[PDB]
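tmp note - eukaryotic translation initiation factor 4E
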Amino acid sequence: KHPLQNRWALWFFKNDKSKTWQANLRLISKFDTVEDFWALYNHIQLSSNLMPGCDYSLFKDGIEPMWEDEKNKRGGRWLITLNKQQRRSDLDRFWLETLLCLIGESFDDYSDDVCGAVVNVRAKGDKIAIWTTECENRDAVTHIGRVYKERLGLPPKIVIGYQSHADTATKKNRFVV
Ligand SMILES: C[n+]1cn([C@@H]2O[C@H](COP(=O)(O)OP(=O)(O)OP(=O)(O)O)[C@@H](O)[C@H]2O)c2nc(N)[nH]c(=O)c21
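out:
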Protein backbone atom coordinates (compact mmCIF):
# COMPACT_ATOMS: atom_id res chain seq x y z
CA LYS A 1 0.00 0.00 0.00
CA HIS A 2 0.99 3.64 -0.48
CA PRO A 3 1.83 5.50 2.75
CA LEU A 4 0.88 9.05 3.67
CA GLN A 5 3.45 11.45 5.17
CA ASN A 6 1.44 11.55 8.41
CA ARG A 7 -0.91 9.31 10.36
CA TRP A 8 -4.37 10.85 10.76
CA ALA A 9 -7.34 10.31 13.08
CA LEU A 10 -11.04 10.95 12.40
CA TRP A 11 -13.14 12.14 15.34
CA PHE A 12 -16.91 12.56 15.70
CA PHE A 13 -18.85 15.00 17.91
CA LYS A 14 -22.50 14.80 18.98
CA ASN A 15 -24.11 17.67 20.88
CA ASP A 16 -25.77 16.33 24.03
CA LYS A 17 -26.07 19.06 26.69
CA SER A 18 -26.36 16.56 29.56
CA LYS A 19 -22.66 15.97 28.90
CA THR A 20 -19.59 18.20 29.03
CA TRP A 21 -18.22 19.24 25.64
CA GLN A 22 -15.11 17.04 25.94
CA ALA A 23 -17.23 14.01 26.87
CA ASN A 24 -19.10 14.29 23.56
CA LEU A 25 -15.97 13.79 21.43
CA ARG A 26 -15.40 10.26 20.04
CA LEU A 27 -12.34 8.87 18.18
CA ILE A 28 -13.60 6.93 15.15
CA SER A 29 -10.62 5.61 13.20
CA LYS A 30 -6.98 6.17 12.21
CA PHE A 31 -5.15 5.67 8.89
CA ASP A 32 -1.72 6.27 7.33
CA THR A 33 -2.18 4.85 3.85
CA VAL A 34 -3.88 6.05 0.65
CA GLU A 35 -5.88 2.82 0.43
CA ASP A 36 -7.00 3.12 4.06
CA PHE A 37 -8.14 6.73 3.63
CA TRP A 38 -10.40 5.82 0.71
CA ALA A 39 -11.68 2.72 2.53
CA LEU A 40 -12.86 5.02 5.32
CA TYR A 41 -14.30 7.78 3.11
CA ASN A 42 -16.20 5.31 0.89
CA HIS A 43 -17.98 3.70 3.83
CA ILE A 44 -18.92 6.43 6.31
CA GLN A 45 -21.80 8.93 6.30
CA LEU A 46 -21.31 12.16 4.32
CA SER A 47 -21.05 15.48 6.19
CA SER A 48 -24.19 16.71 4.44
CA ASN A 49 -26.12 13.83 5.99
CA LEU A 50 -25.08 14.47 9.60
CA MET A 51 -27.66 15.72 12.09
CA PRO A 52 -27.55 19.38 13.15
CA GLY A 53 -25.26 19.65 16.16
CA CYS A 54 -22.60 17.18 15.01
CA ASP A 55 -19.01 17.56 13.74
CA TYR A 56 -16.29 15.51 12.01
CA SER A 57 -12.64 16.40 12.74
CA LEU A 58 -9.49 15.07 11.06
CA PHE A 59 -6.33 15.69 13.09
CA LYS A 60 -2.75 14.42 13.00
CA ASP A 61 -2.30 11.42 15.26
CA GLY A 62 -1.52 12.64 18.75
CA ILE A 63 -3.44 15.92 18.57
CA GLU A 64 -6.92 15.97 20.13
CA PRO A 65 -9.38 18.23 18.23
CA MET A 66 -9.78 20.70 21.09
CA TRP A 67 -8.45 24.09 22.23
CA GLU A 68 -6.87 22.53 25.31
CA ASP A 69 -4.41 20.33 23.39
CA GLU A 70 -0.89 21.72 23.69
CA LYS A 71 -0.59 22.01 19.90
CA ASN A 72 -3.85 24.01 19.62
CA LYS A 73 -3.86 26.29 22.67
CA ARG A 74 -1.63 28.95 21.07
CA GLY A 75 -3.19 28.40 17.65
CA GLY A 76 -6.17 29.46 15.59
CA ARG A 77 -8.26 28.64 12.53
CA TRP A 78 -9.02 29.70 8.94
CA LEU A 79 -12.83 29.76 8.77
CA ILE A 80 -15.16 29.02 5.85
CA THR A 81 -18.86 29.74 6.49
CA LEU A 82 -21.72 28.27 4.40
CA ASN A 83 -25.46 28.91 4.18
CA LYS A 84 -27.87 26.11 5.11
CA GLN A 85 -29.09 26.18 1.50
CA GLN A 86 -25.62 25.19 0.32
CA ARG A 87 -25.56 21.93 2.29
CA ARG A 88 -26.38 19.65 -0.65
CA SER A 89 -24.50 21.66 -3.27
CA ASP A 90 -21.14 22.61 -1.72
CA LEU A 91 -20.57 21.12 1.76
CA ASP A 92 -19.34 17.68 0.71
CA ARG A 93 -17.12 19.05 -2.06
CA PHE A 94 -15.51 21.58 0.31
CA TRP A 95 -14.96 18.95 3.01
CA LEU A 96 -13.32 16.41 0.70
CA GLU A 97 -11.09 19.01 -0.95
CA THR A 98 -10.08 20.10 2.56
CA LEU A 99 -9.22 16.51 3.56
CA LEU A 100 -7.09 16.02 0.45
CA CYS A 101 -5.20 19.26 1.30
CA LEU A 102 -4.29 17.88 4.71
CA ILE A 103 -3.40 14.33 3.68
CA GLY A 104 -1.59 15.43 0.52
CA GLU A 105 0.61 17.86 2.48
CA SER A 106 -0.36 20.75 0.17
CA PHE A 107 1.16 23.36 2.50
CA ASP A 108 4.71 22.09 1.94
CA ASP A 109 7.21 24.20 3.90
CA TYR A 110 4.58 25.06 6.51
CA SER A 111 3.06 21.58 6.88
CA ASP A 112 4.21 21.41 10.51
CA ASP A 113 1.95 24.30 11.44
CA VAL A 114 -1.20 22.41 10.39
CA CYS A 115 -3.03 20.51 13.14
CA GLY A 116 -6.21 19.38 11.40
CA ALA A 117 -9.64 20.35 10.04
CA VAL A 118 -13.18 20.52 11.42
CA VAL A 119 -16.61 20.57 9.75
CA ASN A 120 -19.56 21.75 11.91
CA VAL A 121 -23.15 21.01 10.85
CA ARG A 122 -25.63 23.46 12.38
CA ALA A 123 -29.24 24.56 11.85
CA LYS A 124 -28.16 28.16 11.20
CA GLY A 125 -25.36 27.32 8.78
CA ASP A 126 -22.37 25.03 8.29
CA LYS A 127 -18.68 25.77 8.86
CA ILE A 128 -15.39 24.22 7.75
CA ALA A 129 -12.04 25.23 9.21
CA ILE A 130 -8.33 24.46 9.10
CA TRP A 131 -6.65 24.62 12.53
CA THR A 132 -3.00 25.75 12.86
CA THR A 133 -0.61 25.59 15.81
CA GLU A 134 0.58 29.22 16.27
CA CYS A 135 -1.59 32.29 15.68
CA GLU A 136 1.55 34.49 15.78
CA ASN A 137 3.49 32.90 12.90
CA ARG A 138 2.32 35.35 10.24
CA ASP A 139 4.18 33.81 7.31
CA ALA A 140 2.91 30.30 8.05
CA VAL A 141 -0.68 31.39 8.74
CA THR A 142 -0.84 33.63 5.67
CA HIS A 143 0.58 30.93 3.39
CA ILE A 144 -1.93 28.28 4.53
CA GLY A 145 -4.81 30.70 4.07
CA ARG A 146 -3.86 31.69 0.52
CA VAL A 147 -3.26 28.10 -0.57
CA TYR A 148 -6.52 26.92 1.02
CA LYS A 149 -8.60 29.74 -0.47
CA GLU A 150 -7.30 29.02 -3.98
CA ARG A 151 -7.81 25.25 -3.66
CA LEU A 152 -11.51 25.66 -2.74
CA GLY A 153 -12.00 27.92 -5.75
CA LEU A 154 -13.63 30.69 -3.73
CA PRO A 155 -14.08 33.85 -5.81
CA PRO A 156 -10.95 35.97 -5.04
CA LYS A 157 -13.34 38.68 -3.85
CA ILE A 158 -14.89 36.84 -0.89
CA VAL A 159 -12.30 37.23 1.86
CA ILE A 160 -12.04 34.60 4.59
CA GLY A 161 -10.75 35.29 8.09
CA TYR A 162 -8.38 33.69 10.61
CA GLN A 163 -9.39 33.70 14.31
CA SER A 164 -7.24 32.78 17.32
CA HIS A 165 -8.77 30.10 19.53
CA ALA A 166 -8.20 32.35 22.54
CA ASP A 167 -10.43 35.04 21.03
CA THR A 168 -13.04 32.47 20.03
CA ALA A 169 -13.06 31.06 23.57
CA THR A 170 -13.69 34.51 25.07
CA LYS A 171 -16.63 35.64 22.93
CA LYS A 172 -12.37 39.04 15.69
CA ASN A 173 -10.02 38.23 12.79
CA ARG A 174 -6.24 38.27 13.20
CA PHE A 175 -5.79 37.93 9.43
CA VAL A 176 -7.89 37.92 6.26
CA VAL A 177 -7.33 36.43 2.80
C1 LIG B 1 -14.23 23.77 19.56
N1 LIG B 1 -14.90 23.87 20.85
C2 LIG B 1 -16.13 24.25 21.03
N2 LIG B 1 -16.41 24.22 22.35
C3 LIG B 1 -17.66 24.54 23.17
O1 LIG B 1 -18.69 24.45 22.15
C4 LIG B 1 -19.42 25.73 22.05
C5 LIG B 1 -19.95 25.87 20.65
O2 LIG B 1 -19.00 26.16 19.64
P1 LIG B 1 -18.93 25.36 18.19
O3 LIG B 1 -17.51 25.31 17.76
O4 LIG B 1 -19.39 23.94 18.35
O5 LIG B 1 -19.80 26.11 17.04
P2 LIG B 1 -21.31 26.66 17.19
O6 LIG B 1 -21.67 27.23 15.87
O7 LIG B 1 -22.26 25.57 17.53
O8 LIG B 1 -21.37 27.72 18.21
P3 LIG B 1 -21.25 29.29 18.48
O9 LIG B 1 -20.12 29.70 17.60
O10 LIG B 1 -20.88 29.40 19.94
O11 LIG B 1 -22.50 30.03 18.17
C6 LIG B 1 -18.35 26.69 22.48
O12 LIG B 1 -18.92 27.96 22.89
C7 LIG B 1 -17.77 25.96 23.72
O13 LIG B 1 -18.59 26.02 24.93
C8 LIG B 1 -15.31 23.81 23.02
N3 LIG B 1 -15.22 23.66 24.41
C9 LIG B 1 -14.02 23.25 24.82
N4 LIG B 1 -13.82 23.07 26.10
N5 LIG B 1 -12.98 22.99 23.92
C10 LIG B 1 -13.05 23.14 22.51
O14 LIG B 1 -12.07 22.90 21.69
C11 LIG B 1 -14.22 23.54 22.12
